[PDB]
Amino acid sequence: SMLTELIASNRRSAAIHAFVDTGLSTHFKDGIYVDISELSRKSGVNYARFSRLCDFLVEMGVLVSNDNKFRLSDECHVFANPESFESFMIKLEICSHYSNAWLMYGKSLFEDDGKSAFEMAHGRPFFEYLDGNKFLKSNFDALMTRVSNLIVEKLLGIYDFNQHNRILDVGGGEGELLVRISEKVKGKHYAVLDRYSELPVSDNIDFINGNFLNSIPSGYDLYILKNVLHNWSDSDSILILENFRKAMDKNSSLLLINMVKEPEFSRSFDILMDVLFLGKERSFTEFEYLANQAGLVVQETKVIDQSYSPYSFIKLQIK
Amino acid sequence: SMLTELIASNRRSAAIHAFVDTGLSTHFKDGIYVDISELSRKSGVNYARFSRLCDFLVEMGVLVSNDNKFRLSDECHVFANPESFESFMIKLEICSHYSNAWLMYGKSLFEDDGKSAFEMAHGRPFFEYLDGNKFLKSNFDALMTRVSNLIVEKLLGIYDFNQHNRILDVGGGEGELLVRISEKVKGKHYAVLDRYSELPVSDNIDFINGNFLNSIPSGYDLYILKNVLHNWSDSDSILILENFRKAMDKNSSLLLINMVKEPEFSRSFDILMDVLFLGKERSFTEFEYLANQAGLVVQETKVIDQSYSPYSFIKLQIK
Numbered sequence: 204s205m206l207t208e209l210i211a212s213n214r215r216s217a218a219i220h221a222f223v224d225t226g227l228s229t230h231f232k233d234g235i236y237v238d239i240s241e242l243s244r245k246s247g248v249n250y251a252r253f254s255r256l257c258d259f260l261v262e263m264g265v266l267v268s269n270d271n272k273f274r275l276s277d278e279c280h281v282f283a284n285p286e287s288f289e290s291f292m293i294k295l296e297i298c299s300h301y302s303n304a305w306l307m308y309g310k311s312l313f314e315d316d317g318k319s320a321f322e323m324a325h326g327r328p329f330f331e332y333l334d335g336n337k338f339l340k341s342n343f344d345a346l347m348t349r350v351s352n353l354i355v356e357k358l359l360g361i362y363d364f365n366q367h368n369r370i371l372d373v374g375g376g377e378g379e380l381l382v383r384i385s386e387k388v389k390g391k392h393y394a395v396l397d398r399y400s401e402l403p404v405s406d407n408i409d410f411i412n413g414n415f416l417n418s419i420p421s422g423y424d425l426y427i428l429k430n431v432l433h434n435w436s437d438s439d440s441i442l443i444l445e446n447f448r449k450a451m452d453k454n455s456s457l458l459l460i461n462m463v464k465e466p467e468f469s470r471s472f473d474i475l476m477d478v479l480f481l482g483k484e485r486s487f488t489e490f491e492y493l494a495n496q497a498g499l500v501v502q503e504t505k506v507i508d509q510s511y512s513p514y515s516f517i518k519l520q521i522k
Numbered sequence: 523s524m525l526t527e528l529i530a531s532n533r534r535s536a537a538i539h540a541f542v543d544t545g546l547s548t549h550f551k552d553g554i555y556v557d558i559s560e561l562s563r564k565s566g567v568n569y570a571r572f573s574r575l576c577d578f579l580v581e582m583g584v585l586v587s588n589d590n591k592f593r594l595s596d597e598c599h600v601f602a603n604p605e606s607f608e609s610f611m612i613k614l615e616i617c618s619h620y621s622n623a624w625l626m627y628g629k630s631l632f633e634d635d636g637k638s639a640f641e642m643a644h645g646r647p648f649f650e651y652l653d654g655n656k657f658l659k660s661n662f663d664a665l666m667t668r669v670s671n672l673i674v675e676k677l678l679g680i681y682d683f684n685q686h687n688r689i690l691d692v693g694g695g696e697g698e699l700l701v702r703i704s705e706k707v708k709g710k711h712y713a714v715l716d717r718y719s720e721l722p723v724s725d726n727i728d729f730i731n732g733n734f735l736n737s738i739p740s741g742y743d744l745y746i747l748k749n750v751l752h753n754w755s756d757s758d759s760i761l762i763l764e765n766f767r768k769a770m771d772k773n774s775s776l777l778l779i780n781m782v783k784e785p786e787f788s789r790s791f792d793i794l795m796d797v798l799f800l801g802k803e804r805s806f807t808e809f810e811y812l813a814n815q816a817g818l819v820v821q822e823t824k825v826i827d828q829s830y831s832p833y834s835f836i837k838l839q840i841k
């Protein structure tokens with residue numbers, strides 16, 4: 204049936220997880236045809252059982268079968284690279300913490316606590332729990348770094364960064380957005396604000412330990428907020444954009460950059476943001492509405508096309 | 523993207539799970555259009571957050587949206603019935619025990635210990651663990667009961683049960699197959715062999731606590747073995763069929779009934795049998811081979827069509 208295979212959709216995720224997390228996928232580099240019998244002798248993986256997994260991977264379109272051998276498909280070459288963002292995605296997707304968060308999702312819909320399904324399972328909100336968990340934090344921060352590394356080339360193309368002097372990336376994570384921007388845009392003051400127990404170090408990057416719910420530091424003329432607001436509710440999103448308006452002067456600009464809600468694409472991510480953060484995906488006009496409540500105005504609006512999702516580039520300034 | 527939504531396939535299962543497990547799907551009986559605002563006041567679910575889950579269910583084809591109201595699809599009416607086979611399926615599919623089993627699947631490929639990924643996660647083989655876990659056993663036994671109730675109509679159609687006198691259903695679970703056969707085929711002796719701590723009770727069904735790995739009891743002219751062999755290896759499958767031969771005489775008949783591997787259908791179930799049992803999916807000829815190794819001869823092979831999978835009906839006698 205099609206409904207029973209829809210019920211059994213998790214089996215598709217778990218099969219890819221077993222293929223990628225073990226490191227078996229890293230034997231399929233440069234679109235080579237792998238002999239599974241030779242892979243069995245080299246790595247010690249069970250020939251008969253892994254051959255059954257490969258047949259299911261061929262069904263999913265991850266592998267391609269020819270000449271009694273298997274290659275990764277054109278689109279699934281990323282699984283050969285353990286450094287790829289797709290590798291970090293599946294490692295987090297069906298991990299025990301996410302699984303337990305999903306099992307509290309149903310129950311979380313009836314609660315008016317303000318606690319996410321993640322918090323009900325674990326006892327702390329996502330980012331606070333990550334502070335005491337290397338696995339979740341390292342994989343999450345790594346994923347955020349890879350997607351930051353992918354988009355940066357297009358950001359520099361669509362927006363002139365040389366017109367600015369003092370740049371702050373609010374919730375910048377490991378800080379790879381401004382590090383890569385600073386390499387191609389020279390002789391500027393660069394700062395990255397996030398929650399740091401230990402401050403990261405990089406040449407001409409000012410790492411700040413702070414909280415964007417409490418306050419943003421003033422005196423900067425370019426502010427960046429990439430993939431933050433979709434981890435928050437409307438009220439918290441307004442509170443963040445309010446703290447920008449207090450900090451920002453007349454000359455200042457805020458680049459609200461985020462994955463955007465387009466009808467054509469999947470709502471699956473919208474549900475994940477509800478489970479992990481009690482947040483949501485938003486459209487251009489939804490982002491614009493929250494900005495208007497905070498006391499900000501939309502000057503420019505452009506779309507950035509990434510492989511996995513469309514992005515919403517919004518240049519905001521104060522009233 | 524197509525790759526990231528294949529990676530995020532677990533989100534479909536988990537979204538259906540939250541919809542069914544809570545009992546929100548039971549409000550969508552007989553294809554009625556549910557107002558979510560009305561459902562919010564009645565049951566107490568968050569309006570905005572459940573509305574977002576419904577929009578994702580519309581994308582999956584579980585719900586249909588017309589005039590800001592949601593009904594179940596023609597195929598997905600089953601989710602309205604909490605005692606449906608599909609309702610028990612999703613309740614087991616992404617439960618913590620299955621999740622932890624899948625997370626040991628990758629590691630289990632490199633072991634030649636004879637331990638399933640389930641046993642590696644939980645410390646005992648599947649059925650032995652179900653003895654000390656009512657959640658898994660009651661849901662599993664219930665699922666096996668519902669699929670037994672679905673097939674019995676077609677099974678009575680394609681085989682003459684009136685010719686037989688003494689009937690034993692080996693690994694018959696709660697015994698719903700023989701109970702439904704006994705209701706229409708009257709005046710026969712009926713017995714259901716399985717692993718019972720406490721014997722089930724039913725009108726003229728002889729429930730036997732036993733072990734088909736150890737021996738099958740002799741003195742029956744009809745034997746049934748439905749959806750057992752796909753929970754076992756080839757050697758264990760041969761051991762069971764050998765125990766049938768030693769039990770059976772020249773006039774005896776064994777109905778080997780099981781979900782069969784057809785190229786057209788998904789390999790997803792084959793991987794689940796590997797994770798849970800170290801079992802496998804098998805074709806007609808593969809089933810035929812194991813029977814011939816055990817010293818059984820095929821009399822009559824037929825195909826039974828079911829909604830979710832094709833079934834192999836193999837009549838076996840000794841020689």
Ligand SMILES: Nc1ncnc2c1ncn2[C@@H]1O[C@H](CSCC[C@H](N)C(=O)O)[C@@H](O)[C@H]1O
Nearest residue numbers: 347351374375376397398413414415429430
């Ligand atoms: N109260 C808070 N103050 C500052 N940073 C916070 C915060 N709550 C969450 N964050 C940070 O917000 C980030 C959200 S993920 C986005 C990371 C980065 N901007 C990127 O696009 O790749 C995380 O790095 C998290 O640590």
Ligand SMILES: Nc1ncnc2c1ncn2[C@@H]1O[C@H](CSCC[C@H](N)C(=O)O)[C@@H](O)[C@H]1O
Nearest residue numbers: 666670693694695716717732733734748749
């Ligand atoms: N060693 C053993 N001896 C007897 N029954 C066993 C067994 N190991 C597993 N079983 C039983 O085999 C069944 C597998 S599921 C099949 C149940 C039923 N025949 C149906 O098709 O619906 C379970 O009920 C399980 O309890």
Ligand SMILES: O=C1c2cccc(O)c2C(=O)c2c(O)cc(O)cc21
Nearest residue numbers: 292295296346350430462475479511
């Ligand atoms: O894959 C992503 C992701 C990709 C691109 C941009 C993103 O922001 C994310 C993101 O936030 C995210 C997440 O919060 C939790 C996840 O398990 C996975 C992802």
Ligand SMILES: O=C1c2cccc(O)c2C(=O)c2c(O)cc(O)cc21
Nearest residue numbers: 611614615665669749781794798830
């Ligand atoms: O849905 C089934 C199922 C359906 C029909 C016939 C079956 O045998 C099964 C079965 O065995 C099974 C299982 O062993 C574990 C599961 O999580 C789900 C199922």
Ligand code: NA
Nearest residue numbers: 225226227246
């Ligand atoms: Na390896």
